[PDB]
């Protein structure tokens, strides 16, 4: 499916009720500094289950327009996503601020957060893994993350992490933690069995991602000399240690990974993001200023990858015309004057013009 549009009411700088979109398969959000692009990123995170602490506020009511200056514009606010799928009626997922707490709705019927998250997961939207959302200033961290933190992402997506607590308990019951562990009989078998279950869950995801990442990193690089390797530090128990990620940039010699440029790290991060998608597809990606460190060559290769794929939809926020002029439509954010800054949007179809001379 895809994100047809977002409806926002009195959320941060988005005063009043506003339609954001409709989105095309590749849409860019643009606008001058201070207009409200980062608040729009927060609105998307909010409707997709983000916890209040990650939305730059102390309390939920502070998300209502006008609250940070003591002039809240309403006692309620909302963000809604209209999700569309061929052969199905549109489904609206909404998060409403009412009474200083969140109310979740699917097609205007109130649901609890557990059901909201479960229904989003069926569409490929994982509100804990959050593998579909890349925040401003974060794309490089995906490539340079701690190997152990990369393992944690795979344990969340694969659900192998659901077995970690029982794994740990059975490992100790087998004798781990004693000077000379003496595993035998039922206790050792119980550990071997949970170890196998965790291994199988982890590998069903990891082996898929690791076997698909090279072609994707090449396809991003648009060059057969680039190479990408994902490998466990602990092959027997990959979930126990780090996942190593090393690449060879296209037409370049091997460098560690940290000696790469910001742009090279960005491309490596995107290959991992899209390799995860090849195993568990998300309907859309929201990419906030991922082009910050990219030169023009890599901007073109990334945009072409999106366009020759848009099996997903891409919503990007960008400051760089070299990137945003490759989208099908633009959502332009502008500020209105008031006691607080108000954000509003315009929509513009670039496909009406030749991309040529």
């Amino acid at each position: 499916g895809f994100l047809k549009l977002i409806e926002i009411e009195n959320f941060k700088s988005y005063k009043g009720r506003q339609i954001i979109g409709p989105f095309q398969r590749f849409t860019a959000i643009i606008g001058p500094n201070g207009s409200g692009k980062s608040n729009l990123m927060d609105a998307i995170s909010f409707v997709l289950g983000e916890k209040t602490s990650n939305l730059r506020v102390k309390t939920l009511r502070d998300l209502i327009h006008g609250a940070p200056v003591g002039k809240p514009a309403a006692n309620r606010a909302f963000v809604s996503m209209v999700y569309s799928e061929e052969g199905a009626e549109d489904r609206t997922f909404a998060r409403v601020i009412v009474g200083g707490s969140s109310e979740y709705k699917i097609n205007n019927k109130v649901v609890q957060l557990h059901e909201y998250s479960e229904e989003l997961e069926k569409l490929g939207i994982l509100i804990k893994a959050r593998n579909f959302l890349v925040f401003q200033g974060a794309v490089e961290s995906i490539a340079m993350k701690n190997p152990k933190e990369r393992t944690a992402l795979f344990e969340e997506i694969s659900r192998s992490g659901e077995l970690a607590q029982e794994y740990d308990k059975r490992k100790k019951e087998m004798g781990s933690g004693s000077l000379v562990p003496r595993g035998s009989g039922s206790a050792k078998q119980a550990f071997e069995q949970i170890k196998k279950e965790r291994f199988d869950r982890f590998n069903a995801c990891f082996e898929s991602v690791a076997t698909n990442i090279d072609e994707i990193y090449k396809a991003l690089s648009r060059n057969s000399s680039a190479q990408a390797f994902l490998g466990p530090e602990n092959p027997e128990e990959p979930y126990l240690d780090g996942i190593n990620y090393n690449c060879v940039a296209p037409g370049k010699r091997f460098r560690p990974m940290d000696n790469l440029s910001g742009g090279e790290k960005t491309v490596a991060a995107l290959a991992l993001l899209f390799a995860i998608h090849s195993y568990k597809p998300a309907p859309f990606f929201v990419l906030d200023q991922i082009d910050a460190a990219l030169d023009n060559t890599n901007i073109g290769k990334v945009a072409n990858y999106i366009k020759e794929q848009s099996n997903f939809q891409a919503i990007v926020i960008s400051l760089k015309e070299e990137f945003y002029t490759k989208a099908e439509s633009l959502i332009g954010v502008y500020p209105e004057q008031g006691d607080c800054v108000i954000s509003k949007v315009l929509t513009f179809d670039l496909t009406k013009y030749p991309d040529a001379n």
């Binding site: 339609i19 332009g332 502008y334 315009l346 030749p354 991309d355 001379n357």
Partner: protein, 67 residues
Amino acid sequence: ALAKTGAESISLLELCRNTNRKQAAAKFYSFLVLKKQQAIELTQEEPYSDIIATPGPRFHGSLEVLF
């Protein structure tokens, strides 16, 4: 300088006639900047309809260039 009169409104879609994608995008972005500067007011009837600029509450120079 006095004889450089203008219109009551500017149509973004008319400005972008016979432009390429990069030029059209730049005119769209210019409307966002002019609005932030309060040099224009903006109206858009529906998503993806024409975007119409009228004079805003602050003066602005070189508007014959921007239009």
